[PDB]
Design a protein around this ligand. Structure first.
Ligand SMILES: *C(=C)C1=C(C)[C@@H](Cc2[nH]c(/C=C3N=C(/C=C4\NC(=O)[C@H](C)[C@H]4CC)C(C)=C\3CCC(=O)O)c(CCC(=O)O)c2C)NC1=O
Ligand SMILES: *CCC1=C(C)C(=O)N[C@H]1Cc1[nH]c(/C=C2\N=C(C[C@H]3NC(=O)C(CC)=C3C)C(C)=C2CCC(=O)O)c(CCC(=O)O)c1C
Ligand SMILES: C=CC1=C(C)[C@@H](Cc2[nH]c(/C=C3N=C(/C=C4\NC(=O)[C@H](C)[C@H]4CC)C(C)=C\3CCC(=O)O)c(CCC(=O)O)c2C)NC1=O
Ligand SMILES: C=CC1=C(C)[C@@H](Cc2[nH]c(/C=C3N=C(/C=C4\NC(=O)[C@H](C)[C@H]4CC)C(C)=C\3CCC(=O)O)c(CCC(=O)O)c2C)NC1=O
Ligand SMILES: C=CC1=C(C)[C@@H](Cc2[nH]c(/C=C3N=C(/C=C4\NC(=O)[C@H](C)[C@H]4CC)C(C)=C\3CCC(=O)O)c(CCC(=O)O)c2C)NC1=O
Ligand SMILES: C=CC1=C(C)[C@@H](Cc2[nH]c(/C=C3N=C(/C=C4\NC(=O)[C@H](C)[C@H]4CC)C(C)=C\3CCC(=O)O)c(CCC(=O)O)c2C)NC1=O
Ligand SMILES: C=CC1=C(C)[C@@H](Cc2[nH]c(/C=C3N=C(/C=C4\NC(=O)[C@H](C)[C@H]4CC)C(C)=C\3CCC(=O)O)c(CCC(=O)O)c2C)NC1=O
Ligand SMILES: C=CC1=C(C)[C@@H](Cc2[nH]c(/C=C3N=C(/C=C4\NC(=O)[C@H](C)[C@H]4CC)C(C)=C\3CCC(=O)O)c(CCC(=O)O)c2C)NC1=O
Ligand SMILES: C=CC1=C(C)[C@@H](Cc2[nH]c(/C=C3N=C(/C=C4\NC(=O)[C@H](C)[C@H]4CC)C(C)=C\3CCC(=O)O)c(CCC(=O)O)c2C)NC1=O
Ligand SMILES: C=CC1=C(C)[C@@H](Cc2[nH]c(/C=C3N=C(/C=C4\NC(=O)[C@H](C)[C@H]4CC)C(C)=C\3CCC(=O)O)c(CCC(=O)O)c2C)NC1=O
Ligand SMILES: C=CC1=C(C)[C@@H](Cc2[nH]c(/C=C3N=C(/C=C4\NC(=O)[C@H](C)[C@H]4CC)C(C)=C\3CCC(=O)O)c(CCC(=O)O)c2C)NC1=O
Ligand SMILES: C=CC1=C(C)[C@@H](Cc2[nH]c(/C=C3N=C(/C=C4\NC(=O)[C@H](C)[C@H]4CC)C(C)=C\3CCC(=O)O)c(CCC(=O)O)c2C)NC1=O
Ligand SMILES: C=CC1=C(C)[C@@H](Cc2[nH]c(/C=C3N=C(/C=C4\NC(=O)[C@H](C)[C@H]4CC)C(C)=C\3CCC(=O)O)c(CCC(=O)O)c2C)NC1=O
Ligand SMILES: CCC1=C(C)[C@@H](CC2=N/C(=C\c3[nH]c(C[C@@H]4NC(=O)C(C)=C4CC)c(C)c3CCC(=O)O)C(CCC(=O)O)=C2C)NC1=O
Lengths: 250, 34, 177, 164, 177, 164, 164, 177
């Protein structure tokens, strides 16, 4: 049996930080690794408390179906995880644009000053609060139902503006708005989204009436600095439910 | 999802609007009088 | 509108089948207790005038908010409309029990009634209760178990027709809901 | 840069598809048209001394008020920076003739120009005057060939339409 | 949304007229009793918490059919929602009285409310009564004639602001009708 | 229109709150400052004949090249439409003095101006020349009072900063 | 803290605008009303020992059942912590008279109170009894002036409405 | 975010002290000269459009390497983003001077700005200079000592507000460093 002492790398994790030296630099990078795990806990919390509104009474509502055919939930993981991989392939212009764009919108929906200070300090928490805010009050486009064909065209115009920021200034498609990753996965996405379009028309008479006023308020609070924009939000709520935060490319 | 105008295949949002159910009240109200 | 005989004809026309001997056991049994069906319809249409004023007054002593000021049965005009509304539903249910099929009930009475009572502001809770009291009177009059009127009948069993009219009344109630 | 190549493989990447026959067929036109659109490239690259010279004084001949004090071209270094901008725009047109699309123009001259020209009081009409003066002085058998002249004028007027 | 100042601006913009000295007599009188307008709004928002539970309970002792089984205020959830849209209507009326113009009332609260209450089955008779009791409380609180709360004010007349808020409340009532 | 009123009740509506003491306190300044900002309103409304007249020729005196053929003010009806625009902008400043905020300016003169002035070749410097000429000709005890003049110049320079 | 200042510059920050004339005009009311709302501040700050004393026993005089065993005020230290809460609420009302809005109340007494008072079995009616007893004992020329009394009562009833 | 009034409230809340008469001498002096603070903010927001193009062009005249090929202000897109910055920082500094407290400056503008400019490759030395020229313009516009624009003011001293905005600008500069 040989005589093997503990190596030096096995002993460098027991050290004490000294700020006066260069050993401050390794406890730079030891700390933002922990402060991203903090953010991934913060966003995980704020996702779950909003997500608890889709099941208000212990029974799963029809808002969070995922799986109408036999393998539709197993491909949904492959959609979402590849989208999360491509989310951090953006360059330093887009990430720092999206962070400061989310800080203009999280700061106007927060009520107390600590809640706005939290979205200020942690950017993933501010990314998740904006999502959970549009999920519990269904002002997303995946739940917005137009009423007349007038308002359907009125929502199509805003959506055509929103798709244009999914391409570059040249006209080349950006890597954000992408609908496939493999062979036949875009067809799987097309079959997956029409079921959600049918599930949004199966709401109750109370839920349609609630999300009408929630969409008008979302339109006139976040994307209206003028009187004509809020006049459009007050009459066509589905038009107001098609304005994204612009942190998304699509 | 995206509206039917751009990048979209088949027709959607087959849901009862208030105008259509107003017409369905009205046709019954006419039939009762007839 | 259809009846019990034509109901199996649209079922056979869906497959271009002739009505054979399998299909006629249900219809020759419809003929055997046809006299019980006429005797059951005659008991309902005899006391149909008491049944509406029985049921609507029961719906009132349920809920005095209908005769409250501003209530839905507050005016003489509204009470008459409600009384007239109660006679129409009892008429179409007795049509459906006579025909042996619920078809004439839900394209001439219940088709478009929900939206109508929503547009008028007619409260649906009391509409359910006015129909359920009439259903309870129907099973009592068919099985000859009313408290203070007994009718002469030939002896035998009649719970099948009572269950049929009970099946028509909750069709009415689920339609107006 | 938006070109014939980068369009068809981002449309394929957004759909998750391999390069199909349409993707190969689109690059076949990049073989035919590149004989004409590259012939104007060295023609502009070799004689870029005189085109900037002939556009810059035409800009100030249309608008003599720019040399007044308080205006954009009041002193000498401002006129020196003004000729540099026409040199920049002709360099971007030379690049766009080489890529085969409006890539380098849209990235380096078009995006954000409408903010800096309004903030620094640069009149866009005086910018498009020089490009239009370059545009009407194209002797179609003498400057270049016919199709090279078509490809050159189609990139000049794109910049004209984008600046106005 | 608009206010009292911008209301005359859209009236002058319809004819490309400058706002002259004729138009400013209505607005300089809006400034003279502006302190009375702030003193009137402060009296309403002080007792706004009592006003909803005052009015909704008055609407209940009007009509016990709302707390009847199947009634529209029968559940705790439905009673909380009724106390919620009492407060929303009182909030937007106090916005309109503060602004001096009814514009923010009928594009953010009343636009689309009638077909919402028709689609929900909310009875409009009691909706009128819950608004009228709040209107009667508003004229009592502005003119300082409540039974058991008196507020300190400088002496003077305030029936013009009371008539203005009375004009806003029947706008609400005619909208939900 | 953005004013003192419409700011504080939309901040209250976005939070779902009743009008608090800050909301009432903000309108108290709308009582003090409206003696000064309304005094300039009828002063501009009664003498709007000469201000447009004195700004329009100063615009063409700074820029005499606009009357050349091919330019913006080449014929008579274009100069007639040019004086109409200065009348429009002074009417919007008169409106903004009455509301108490930059509401009518931002809705009717500012939003979308940077597209139409670039599409129709209208030089924005010639637009701000007339507004600046109105700005430096404010005799602070003679045109109006002191406070009024401050409120008038603060709305003129807002339009100047927004147009450039 | 929600005040007259922090409302109008967050409405400007959300729109990306400079402070306009409405933003300046809103702070002018913060000059007029601060003579009245600050006069109640030192009046409550100097005599804050008799008001807590007079509210605390009125709370237990309305509700004598709280001193029963098993209830909230069964022993002495619980009554000591009960008087501390009325001192806390009067300190927050003193702060809100100084900021000019319901900022410190909404941050430090209102947010999350409806959870802790239900979890720890504290009856909110006994909380609002002391605040109402403070409210009706305002002799409007003797305690303070008239407008200072209005500003004080408007912050007391806001806490009353928020706690119930 | 905080202002000058709430700044002493969080200082008193740290010790559970009431705001007494000692604390209000700093705040009643904040109100006394409230007209000078509004007159100082109005002078900055009037010439804010000239201030960015003044400062960024001064930053160019000193370092031609920014408009050099490959430089950080070389593209029209990059020049527009730098002018977009010159305005955001001037906007938040004018917020902080209006509020009388630097709190809204360093959690909405400067919190996370240094590592943003490090991650983008934005030169820090060049940045400092764009902020210092704007600071020099701010002290000239507050004390009414610009070369070619003089604004009408009531006579008096204003070096305290000039020193306050000078104290905000090097807070910005030390934050981006
Ligand atoms: C390049 C080497 C270089 C410049 C470009 C130029 C820029 C500059 N200017 C100052 C000082 C001021 N700048 C001001 C801004 C404006 N002046 C105006 O009158 C309008 C309103 C506005 C722009 C349209 C102001 C007010 C001053 C203060 C003095 C004054 O009365 O003008 C500096 C800093 C100090 C200096 O170098 O002069 C710079 C860099 N100067 C250049 O050197
Ligand atoms: C949002 C990203 C985007 C922008 C911007 C744009 O212009 N187009 C999209 C990306 C994109 N997608 C494709 C091809 C396909 N996309 C789908 C999915 C859609 N079909 C559906 O049924 C639904 C939901 C109900 C969606 C989203 C499909 C099925 C294809 C075709 C797949 C294939 O193998 O051909 C393309 C390529 C060009 C095109 O538009 O078809 C792009 C750029
Ligand atoms: C104080 C505590 C302490 C320890 C626990 C060890 C563990 C340890 N092993 C290695 C290093 C190594 N460790 C392994 C071990 C293994 N690889 C396998 O596939 C097997 C699963 C496993 C053996 C059972 C190997 C193969 C290397 C060499 C890697 C290399 O040379 O590239 C190193 C890096 C230093 C070096 O390169 O030698 C350390 C710290 N040493 C310590 O000082
Ligand atoms: C607890 C709260 C709660 C939610 C938020 C939702 C969460 C949720 N999001 C999606 C799925 C999604 N959700 C969004 C979000 C939005 N869509 C938009 O257009 C807007 C920008 C935004 C609303 C504010 C998007 C873009 C997807 C598609 C992602 C994907 O399918 O890969 C799905 C199912 C489909 C899938 O993931 O494949 C679910 C269950 N459910 C919940 O129970
Ligand atoms: C609170 C108010 C109130 C009323 C007004 C009465 C009304 C009433 N009667 C019946 C129940 C009934 N109601 C009738 C109807 C009639 N009976 C006859 O003998 C006549 C022919 C005819 C009216 C003249 C019949 C036949 C029954 C079944 C039991 C029976 O009467 O033998 C029911 C349903 C079951 C029940 O509650 O008993 C109600 C609500 N009862 C009430 O509780
Ligand atoms: C890669 C593309 C690219 C461009 C197109 C230019 C665009 C451009 N021009 C100028 C800057 C300038 N540009 C001009 C040019 C003109 N003024 C006029 O009246 C005429 C219209 C025109 C000359 C014909 C002048 C005079 C300045 C100096 C303005 C100033 O310094 O404030 C600046 C500011 C920085 C600098 O001084 O360079 C920029 C980004 N630069 C670029 O890097
Ligand atoms: C922006 C403006 C705005 C409003 C005015 C309100 C009004 C309003 N109330 C309800 C919803 C409701 N509103 C009522 C209210 C009443 N029923 C009665 O019998 C009384 C007459 C009245 C109370 C005094 C009830 C009981 C429900 C619940 C219905 C249900 O749960 O089925 C809904 C549908 C959403 C939901 O289900 O909660 C809306 C939009 N909400 C708003 O957002
Ligand atoms: C049948 C059921 C029934 C009720 C529940 C009460 C409710 C009620 N109160 C008022 C009438 C009023 N209601 C209030 C409201 C309030 N009064 C206060 O002093 C508090 C501040 C606040 C509730 C705490 C006010 C201020 C008036 C006007 C008269 C007054 O109280 O001085 C009215 C309208 C006119 C009237 O009928 O008197 C009604 C229906 N009255 C009823 O008939
Ligand atoms: C920031 C909050 C804020 C307020 C709450 C109001 C507070 C307020 N109200 C009035 C003043 C007044 N308020 C009233 C109103 C009334 N008197 C009555 O007897 C009626 C019951 C009631 C009618 C609705 C009257 C009549 C005056 C005096 C006339 C006037 O000042 O216009 C005054 C002027 C007198 C003074 O106090 O110096 C003030 C400051 N202003 C504000 O700035
Ligand atoms: C409500 C606000 C409002 C405005 C500000 C103007 C803005 C404006 N001006 C013009 C249109 C015009 N505007 C001008 C004005 C000028 N050209 C110059 O060189 C000078 C800068 C200026 C005169 C001093 C001219 C000459 C035209 C005619 C251009 C054309 O017809 O193509 C047009 C096109 C339609 C039209 O002819 O009216 C519009 C919308 N109109 C408005 O409704
Ligand atoms: C900054 C604002 C602020 C407050 C408002 C209070 C609120 C408050 N009170 C208590 C805690 C308590 N609060 C009370 C008070 C009362 N019980 C009654 O019956 C009466 C209604 C009232 C006295 C008049 C009592 C008796 C306890 C002790 C309960 C316990 O220890 O479980 C606690 C738990 C921690 C503690 O013991 O302090 C808190 C957070 N504290 C604060 O920091
Ligand atoms: C909320 C606060 C807030 C800010 C302070 C700004 C600051 C800011 N600027 C940029 C982005 C930029 N910022 C600059 C600015 C400069 N480069 C220089 O050499 C000069 C020193 C300086 C101008 C004076 C440039 C040139 C870019 C573009 C970098 C690029 O396009 O690659 C970005 C990344 C997003 C983007 O790409 O646009 C941010 C957050 N934006 C904000 O939202
Ligand atoms: C709504 C918009 C709004 C404003 C813009 C200000 C406008 C304003 N400024 C001052 C008043 C003043 N402003 C200044 C400031 C200065 N004087 C100088 O010589 C220096 C250059 C500069 C220092 C920064 C001084 C010294 C006074 C007089 C002292 C004072 O009133 O405090 C006054 C009081 C005198 C008066 O006009 O009646 C007013 C109303 N107030 C407002 O309500
Ligand atoms: C990050 C990409 C990603 C996902 C999203 C999930 C998608 C997903 N959900 C599932 C399964 C599932 N999905 C939901 C609904 C949904 N889930 C919830 O936790 C709440 C609150 C919901 C909306 C009401 C429920 C309630 C179940 C449990 C069914 C069961 O256990 O029987 C299953 C298992 C399917 C199966 O076993 O056949 C998958 C793969 N997985 C992924 O990889």
């Amino acid at each position: 049996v040989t005589g093997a002492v503990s190596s030096v790398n096995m002993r460098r994790f027991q050290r004490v930080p000294k700020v006066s030296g260069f050993s401050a630099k390794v406890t730079k990078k030891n700390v933002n690794k922990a402060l991203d795990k903090a953010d991934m806990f913060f966003a995980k919390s704020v996702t779950m408390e909003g997500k608890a509104a889709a099941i208000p009474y212990g029974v799963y509502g029809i808002q969070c179906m995922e799986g109408s055919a036999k393998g539709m939930a197993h491909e949904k993981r492959a959609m979402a995880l590849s989208a999360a991989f491509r989310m951090n392939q953006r360059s330093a212009a887009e990430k720092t644009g999206a962070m400061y764009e989310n800080r203009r919108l999280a700061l106007i929906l927060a009520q107390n000053d600590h809640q706005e200070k939290q979205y200020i300090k942690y950017p993933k928490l501010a990314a998740a609060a904006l999502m959970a805010s549009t999920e519990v009050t269904r002002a997303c486009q995946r739940y917005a139902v137009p009423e007349s064909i007038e308002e359907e065209f009125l929502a199509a115009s805003v959506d055509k503006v929103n798709k244009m920021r999914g391409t570059t200034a040249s006209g080349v498609y950006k890597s954000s708005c992408v609908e496939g990753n493999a062979k036949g996965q875009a067809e799987q996405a097309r079959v997956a989204a029409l079921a959600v379009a049918f599930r949004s028309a199966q709401k109750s008479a109370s839920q349609f009436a609630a999300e009408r006023y929630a969409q008008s308020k979302y339109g006139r609070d976040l994307f209206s600095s003028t009187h004509f924009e809020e006049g459009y939000a007050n009459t066509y709520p589905a038009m107001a439910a098609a304005k994204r935060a612009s942190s998304y490319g699509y | 999802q995206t509206g039917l105008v751009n990048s979209k295949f088949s027709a959607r949002m087959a849901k009862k609007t208030a105008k259509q159910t107003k017409n369905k009240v009205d046709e019954y109200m006419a039939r009762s009088v007839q | 509108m259809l009846d019990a005989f034509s109901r199996v004809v649209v079922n056979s026309d869906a497959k271009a089948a002739y009505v054979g001997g399998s299909d006629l056991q249900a219809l020759k049994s419809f003929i055997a207790d046809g006299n019980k069906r006429l005797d059951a319809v005659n008991s309902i249409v005899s006391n149909a005038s008491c049944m509406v004023s029985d049921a609507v007054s029961g719906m009132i002593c349920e809920n005095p908010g209908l005769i409250s000021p501003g209530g839905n049965c507050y005016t003489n005009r509204r009470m008459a409309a409600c009384l007239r509304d109660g006679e129409i539903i009892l008429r179409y249910v007795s049509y459906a029990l006579l025909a042996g099929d619920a078809s004439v009930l839900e394209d001439r009475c219940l088709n478009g009634l929900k939206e109508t009572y929503i547009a008028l502001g007619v409260p649906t809770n009391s509409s359910i209760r006015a129909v359920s009291i009439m259903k309870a009177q129907a099973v009592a009059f068919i099985t000859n178990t009313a408290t203070e009127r007994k009718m002469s009948f030939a002896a035998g069993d009649c719970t099948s027709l009572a269950s049929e009219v009970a099946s028509y009344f909750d069709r009415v109630g689920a339609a107006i809901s | 840069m938006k070109s014939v190549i980068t369009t068809v493989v981002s449309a394929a990447d957004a759909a998750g598809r391999f390069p199909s026959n349409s993707d190969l067929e689109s690059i076949q036109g990049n073989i035919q048209r590149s004989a004409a659109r590259l012939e104007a490239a060295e023609k502009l690259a070799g004689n870029h001394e005189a085109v900037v010279k002939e556009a810059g004084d035409a800009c100030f001949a249309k608008y003599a008020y720019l040399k007044n004090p308080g205006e954009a071209g009041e002193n000498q270094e401002k006129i020196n920076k003004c000729y540099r901008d026409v040199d920049h725009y002709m360099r971007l047109v030379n690049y766009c003739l080489v890529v085969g699309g409006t890539g380098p123009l849209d990235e380096w001259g078009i995006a954000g120009a409408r903010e800096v020209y309004r903030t620094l009081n640069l009149p866009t009409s005086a910018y498009v005057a020089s490009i239009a003066y370059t545009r009407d002085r194209l002797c179609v058998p003498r400057d270049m060939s016919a199709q090279a002249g078509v490809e050159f004028s189609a990139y000049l007027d794109y910049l004209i339409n984008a600046l106005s």
